[PDB]
Design a protein around this ligand. Structure first.
Ligand SMILES: O=C(NC[C@H](O)CN1CCc2ccccc2C1)c1ccnc(NC2CCC2)c1
Ligand SMILES: Nc1ncnc2c1ncn2[C@@H]1O[C@H](C[C@@H](N)CC[C@H](N)C(=O)O)[C@@H](O)[C@H]1O
Lengths: 625, 313
């Protein structure tokens, strides 16, 4: 089901109007709070002293109704950026008056237009209102995909519509919004009400709004085509945009009069409901990740902290990660012990980081599938999980599994291993210190022993998202660096964002590592070709891993494993947003650093402009050894 | 409350929007309720011009669904209304002229209709809206013949030429005054002074020269424009605030009535020099209509609910 509202600029009776739109099936109404034509004077007499009332009464609706059903509209005559000083002054005061009245009423949202380039003073007055008193109203900016000047009929003899195409010119509307929200310093209270037109612009200038805070999409009745039975429908390319907007989850707003008088008004809405009912249903991934959209999670300390029972519980439900592990062990057993040896050669298998034991079970399922015999060690450093393991081995596993309660870097092994199995991977592959762990444990792997996984590679892509940039900014805490939020990676189901270039490999690790001098430190330079105008807010991290041969796991979107919810992307943010033009190259630099006690990342952008080196020394974020 | 005839409402809303003298001397009133519980409008006829705004001594009256942003006479019994509801509606007067009855109500604009003008023939009219469109109407057939999206901002004023059925002016907040001629494939032509100044707010054709017109801007300046010159002839800073209307006298050499949001009336000659000024209003002055019977008598209405009759030298 869709959430939708009716836009109106004419309300004779608030009681009757709200009833009609409710019966039509709308969830809410966009209406004026003062009469649109009721121009008020604030400075010079006698119009200044106009007998009240200034507008109608709050008593006309219940508190609940004001809070949930009404979206306010700024009066169309209010022009804070007028060239006329007197009009400037009155509009300043009138805007405050209407805004204060919305706050007074407890309106959940309030609509203000961006219908020209210069909105500086409008921005100032709104910023001033945001920082005056205590209120939580959302401010929706009404901004069109295509500017009114670029949509006008080519019917002025002496002023033709400049026929020569402009890539940047058709993007002017985004720059109206970008400038506004920059002046207002990315207030979390200012969102977008995107107006859709009959002529959808070129596909790029639509892309532009990818990753901006869109809360509503305004659909004028005039853009609706009419079918064989006289019902309102939309073009194929309009349906495309609607489905993209539904995936993002926004509210829809029908504006304009009913242009199909043969049927009712609920028909426009019936179609949107029809379109929403006709989307593909959520996949296995989207059912488990359903409520995680753009929710930033602080980096886990894999070695310093212990995972909660309920954490193990959730991930153990992954429909693919464990069967992929089973198959990797299945293929490795066959390759290591030939048919004539199926009863004589018993393979020694070590699960390093055994958790509550699902990989141990996977190893058992693999051996009885390959018809080969194995001896299992189950090493786990989390003493609380060790509890689950030892109850399992007593009730079920038997002496085939030897549970070891220690750190793998410390464990003095009684015998060397044929195969070491481990799942020590974070969202950026090596961010839970899997390299360091398997390095301290490889001394008890046989000289010809296999490590599962065999290797892993991290990936980076540059992203645009004012939504996520604001979320990171809001992570500022007391009693630390006021900018530390920006100098650590976040695990997040990225949703309201725009990927600016294809993912490229970052860091790679192979196991075992027979390198004479073992060094896990890294320095990598990546160049990202960008082919749109945009603002850089950070870098999405993904990973791929080779378990065994061709058996793999991936969260890289191109090669993602179906149904695998176990890992979300990581987000590396940057202190300051960086402007990027069409045709430019984003150059980033990532270092993996370490000492005896901790491992951390440091990153910097070097093109088109430089950023400050982020997280120098691990001052804001490290992972403890 | 002397009478108030059948169908006529008991009360008239505070904000007087329009006043128009009929040829026979009767006075048409348009009004809106721009505050309070109900945001509606009403239409009134006063055969006794001195009786207005008193609802008691009126000839006819009716309630419209929404506010009246603009209106005009259609011949002698027709009333054409620009409505808040987006509708353009025609009200036909009674044969006894005691009832005002709806003829058509067509919801064609997507926003408030702010301006209407009847074309010379009297069979067709042009409407302008906040939805940025301008529409051409067949009054007998009750349909839109042509819809034009020439402007880039809301349409402020549309004024039909005195004698040519295909020519009209229009101005918008996109800073464009457009001279129209629907005989051309590209009907609109951008007309101004030299350098683009303050937004045009009001337009009036010369009642005798179908080639000259006046426009008031939002800064209170009134200017005289020749179409065949494309040069701004004469200009004067008449008002301290936005000029909302301009109405020529029915005189041989016509005087120009000029109304403003500074709550004052001005009457200017052909060279735009000040002859008369009235501060009789305490709120916005909304319309001016010259008496057909007495050509030195001028009636103004305002949001102060005052109907004022002026004597002009
Ligand atoms: O990517 C995530 N965390 C980073 C960890 O490195 C993920 N792994 C997944 C496999 C696993 C298995 C056992 C114990 C811990 C982990 C952590 C993450 C965080 C929060 N929710 C996630 N997915 C939701 C669980 C239902 C969807 C994933
Ligand atoms: N250095 C270490 N030595 C021993 N165990 C570790 C070490 N580092 C991490 N672990 C454990 O390895 C496990 C990693 C988990 N992601 C995997 C759990 C389990 N094998 C599963 O797939 O459900 C956690 O239970 C950690 O407590």
């Amino acid at each position: 089901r869709v959430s939708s509202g009716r836009d109106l600029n004419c309300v004779p009776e608030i009681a009757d109007t709200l009833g009609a739109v409710a019966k039509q099936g709308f969830d809410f109404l966009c209406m004026p709070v003062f009469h649109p034509r009721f121009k008020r004077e604030f400075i010079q007499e006698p119009a200044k002293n106009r007998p009240g009332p200034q507008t109608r009464s709050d008593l006309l609706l219940s508190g609940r109704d004001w809070n949930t059903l009404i979206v306010g509209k700024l009066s169309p005559w209010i022009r804070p950026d007028s060239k006329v000083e007197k009009i400037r002054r009155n509009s300043e005061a009138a805007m405050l008056q209407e805004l204060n009245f919305g706050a007074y009423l407890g309106l959940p949202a309030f609509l203000l237009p961006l219908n020209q380039e210069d909105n500086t003073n409008l921005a100032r007055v709104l910023t001033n209102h945001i920082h005056t008193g205590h209120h939580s109203s959302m401010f929706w900016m009404r901004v069109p995909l295509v500017a009114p000047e670029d949509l006008r009929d080519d019917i002025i003899e002496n002023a033709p519509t400049t026929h020569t195409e402009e890539y940047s010119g058709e993007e002017k509307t985004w720059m109206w919004w970008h400038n506004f929200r920059t002046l207002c310093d990315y207030s979390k209270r200012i969102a977008v009400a995107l107006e859709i037109g009959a002529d959808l612009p070129s596909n790029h200038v639509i892309d532009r709004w990818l990753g901006e805070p869109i809360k509503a999409a305004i659909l004028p009745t005039s853009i609706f085509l009419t079918n064989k039975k006289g019902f309102p429908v939309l073009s194929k390319m309009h349906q495309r945009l609607i489905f993209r907007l539904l995936k993002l989850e926004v509210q829809f707003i029908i504006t304009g009069t009913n242009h199909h008088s043969e049927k009712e008004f609920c028909s426009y809405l019936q179609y949107l409901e029809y379109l929403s009912q006709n989307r593909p249903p959520p996949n296995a991934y989207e059912l488990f990740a359903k409520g995680y959209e753009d929710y930033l999670q602080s980096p886990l300390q894999p070695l310093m902290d212990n995972l909660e029972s309920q954490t193990y519980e959730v991930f153990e439900k992954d429909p693919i990660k464990y069967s992929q592990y089973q198959q990797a062990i299945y293929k490795c057993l066959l390759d290591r012990v030939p048919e004539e040896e199926k009863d004589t050669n018993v393979q020694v298998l070590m699960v390093l980081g055994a958790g509550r034991g699902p990989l141990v079970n996977a190893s058992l399922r693999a051996a009885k599938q390959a018809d080969r015999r194995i001896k299992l060690y189950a090493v786990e450093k989390n003493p609380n999980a060790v509890v689950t393991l030892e109850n399992w081995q007593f009730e079920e596993w038997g002496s085939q599994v030897t549970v070891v309660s220690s750190d793998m870097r410390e464990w003095v092994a009684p015998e060397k291993a044929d195969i070491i199995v481990s799942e020590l991977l974070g969202s950026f592959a090596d961010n839970e210190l899997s390299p360091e762990c398997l390095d301290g444990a490889q001394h008890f792997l046989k000289d010809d022993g296999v490590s599962i996984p065999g290797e892993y590679t991290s990936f980076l892509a540059p992203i645009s998202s004012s939504k996520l940039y604001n979320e990171v900014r809001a992570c500022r805490e007391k009693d630390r660096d006021p900018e530390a939020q920006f100098e650590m990676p976040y695990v997040v189901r990225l949703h309201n964002f725009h990927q600016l270039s294809a993912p490229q490999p970052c860091f790679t690790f192979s196991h075992p590592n027979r390198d004479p001098m073992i060094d896990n430190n890294r320095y990598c330079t990546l160049e990202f070709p960008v082919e749109v105008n945009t603002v850089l807010h950070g870098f999405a991290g993904y990973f791929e891993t080779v378990l065994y041969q061709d058996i793999t796991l991936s969260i890289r979107p191109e090669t993602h494993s179906p149904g695998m919810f176990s890992w979300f992307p990581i987000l590396f943010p940057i202190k300051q947003p960086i402007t990027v033009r069409e045709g430019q190259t984003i150059c980033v630099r990532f270092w993996r650093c370490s000492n005896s006690k901790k491992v951390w990342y440091e990153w910097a952008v070097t093109a088109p402009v430089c950023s400050a080196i982020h997280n120098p020394t691990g001052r804001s974020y490290t992972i403890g050894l | 409350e002397w009478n108030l005839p059948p169908n006529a409402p008991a009360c008239m809303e505070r904000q007087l929007e329009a006043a128009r003298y009929r040829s026979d001397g009767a006075l048409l009133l348009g009004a809106s309720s721009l505050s309070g519980r109900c945001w509606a409008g009403s239409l009134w006829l006063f055969k006794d011009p001195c009786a207005a705004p008193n609802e008691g001594f009126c000839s006819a009256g009716v309630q419209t669904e929404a506010g009246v942003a603009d209106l005009t006479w259609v011949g002698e019994r027709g009333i054409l209304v620009a409505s808040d509801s987006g509708a353009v509606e025609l009200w036909e007067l009674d044969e006894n002229e005691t009832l005002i009855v709806s003829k058509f109500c067509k919801y064609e604009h997507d926003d408030i209709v702010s301006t209407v003008s009847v074309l010379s023939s009297g069979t067709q009219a042009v409407s302008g809206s906040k939805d940025i469109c301008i529409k051409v109407w067949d009054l007998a057939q009750q349909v839109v013949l042509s819809s034009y999206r020439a402007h880039a901002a809301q349409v402020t004023c549309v004024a039909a030429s005195p004698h040519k059925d295909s020519v009209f002016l229009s101005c918008s907040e996109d800073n464009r005054i457009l001279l129209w001629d629907t005989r051309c494939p590209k009907p609109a032509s951008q007309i101004g002074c030299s350098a683009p100044g303050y937004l045009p707010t009001s337009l009036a054709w010369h009642p005798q020269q179908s080639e000259v017109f006046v426009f008031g801007d939002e800064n209170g300046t009134v200017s005289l424009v020749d179409t065949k010159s494309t040069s701004c002839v004469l200009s004067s800073a008449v008002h301290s605030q936005c000029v909302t209307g301009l109405v020529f006298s029915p005189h041989s050499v016509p005087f120009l009535a000029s109304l403003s949001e500074d709550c004052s009336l001005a009457v200017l000659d052909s060279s735009l020099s000040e002859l008369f000024r009235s501060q009789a209003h305490r709120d916005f002055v909304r319309d001016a209509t010259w008496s057909p019977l007495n050509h030195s008598l001028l009636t103004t209405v305002g949001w102060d609910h005052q109907v004022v009759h002026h004597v002009v030298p």
